[PDB]
Amino acid sequence: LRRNEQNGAAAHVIAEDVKLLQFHVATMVDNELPGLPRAMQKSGRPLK
């Protein structure tokens, strides 16, 4: 995201990147969010 903002990347690129960043942060805080995908550990086991 920092590099995209530095380069002035596409607004939709930055929007999707911010969406993924929000997803990652919220998932780290809580992996049991209602009606949202679960973050696996590349082996099918949901992260704690």
Partner 1 sequence: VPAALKRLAKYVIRGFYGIEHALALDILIRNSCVKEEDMLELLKFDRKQLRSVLNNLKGDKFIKCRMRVETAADGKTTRHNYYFINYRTLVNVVKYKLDHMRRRIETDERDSTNRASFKCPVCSSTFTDLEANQLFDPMTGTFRCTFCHTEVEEDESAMPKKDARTLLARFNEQIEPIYALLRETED
Partner 2 sequence: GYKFGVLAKIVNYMKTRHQRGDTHPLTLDEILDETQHLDIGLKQKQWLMTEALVNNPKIEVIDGKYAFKPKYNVRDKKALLRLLDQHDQRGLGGILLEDIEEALPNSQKAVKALGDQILFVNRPDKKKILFFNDKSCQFSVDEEFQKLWRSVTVDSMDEEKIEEYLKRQGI
Partner 3 sequence: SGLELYAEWKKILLSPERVHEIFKRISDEECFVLGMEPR
Q: CB of residue 33 vs partner 3: minimum separation in angstroms?
A: 7
Number of H helices, E strands in the chain: 2, 0
19 binds, among partner 1, partner 3, partner 2, none (CB under 5 to 8 A by kind): partner 3
1 near partner 1 (CB under 8 A): no
6 binds, among partner 2, partner 1, partner 3, none (CB under 5 to 8 A by kind): partner 2
Task: Please tell me the distance from the alpha carbon of residue 35 to that of residue 39, in angstroms, as a whole number.
Answer: 13
Q: Determine contact, residues 38/31, Cβ cutoff 8 Å.
A: yes
